[PDB]
Specification:
Chain A: F-type ATPases have 2 components, CF(1) - the catalytic core - and CF(0) - the membrane proton channel. CF(1) has five subunits: alpha(3), beta(3), gamma(1), delta(1), epsilon(1). CF(0) has three main subunits: a, b and c. Chain A: Produces ATP from ADP in the presence of a proton gradient across the membrane. The structure is cut from a larger assembly and holds chains A and B. By secondary structure, chain A is an all-alpha fold. Chain A has one domain. Helices cover 46% and strands 0% of the residues of chain A. Chain A contains three helices and no strands. The longest helix of chain B is centred in the N-terminal third of the chain and has 11 residues. By secondary structure, chain B is α+β, with helices and mostly antiparallel strands. Classes of the chains: A mainly alpha, B alpha+beta. Chains A and B meet through loops of A and helix 5 of B.
Chain lengths: 69, 118
């Protein structure tokens, strides 16, 4: 887009067409039909969550401190 | 003794005891003066026998029946204290009341994960 005194190029991140975007959409439908769920990549949250789940297990604190709740 | 007289006459009776824990506490108060060595938590050595010799005659029989409700104090809310622990075995239905439920204003404060019945 060339303007009176400015010019801006609204580039995009990946090759765009119709042969490609259609394959992307086909796979987006396929992953929805067969309930295919990928994992995220967050190894940090994964380790922290596993330590937090193991630490809180069989803890039974509320039976012990007589917190009425 | 009065409940037993009414039972043997062929009737069927209700017997309400206001707090049976005091019956063993009064024995604990006197035990050491009778010259007997203390047991687990200062309780008399004959706790289970003093308790059984009473609760074995409060029963229904082929000639007549006694239905009984007994309040049982548990000291310091400790359900494992020797006295409640030895009392549990002598009852058909045990209803266990808890302070952590009463403090919520939920009355009667029965604990349904500990109340049980034969």
């Amino acid at each position: 887009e060339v303007q009176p005194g400015n010019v801006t190029v609204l580039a995009d991140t990946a090759i765009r067409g119709q042969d490609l975007d259609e394959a992307r959409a086909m796979e987006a439908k396929r992953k929805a039909e067969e309930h295919i769920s990928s994992s995220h990549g967050d190894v940090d949250y994964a380790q922290a969550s596993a330590e937090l789940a193991k630490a809180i297990a069989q803890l039974r604190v509320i039976e012990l401190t007589k917190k009425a709740m | 003794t009065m409940a037993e007289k009414f039972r043997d006459e062929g009737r069927d009776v209700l017997l309400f005891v206001d707090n049976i824990y005091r019956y063993t506490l009064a024995g604990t108060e006197v035990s050491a003066l009778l010259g007997r060595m203390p047991s687990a938590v200062g309780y008399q050595p004959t706790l289970a026998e003093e308790m059984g010799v009473l609760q074995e005659r409060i029963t229904s029989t082929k000639t007549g029946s006694i239905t009984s409700v007994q309040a049982v104090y548990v000291p310091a809310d400790d359900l494992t204290d020797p006295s409640p622990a030895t009392t549990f075995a002598h009852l058909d239905a045990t209803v266990v009341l808890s302070r952590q439920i009463a403090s919520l204003g939920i009355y009667p404060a029965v604990d349904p994960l500990d109340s049980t019945s034969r």
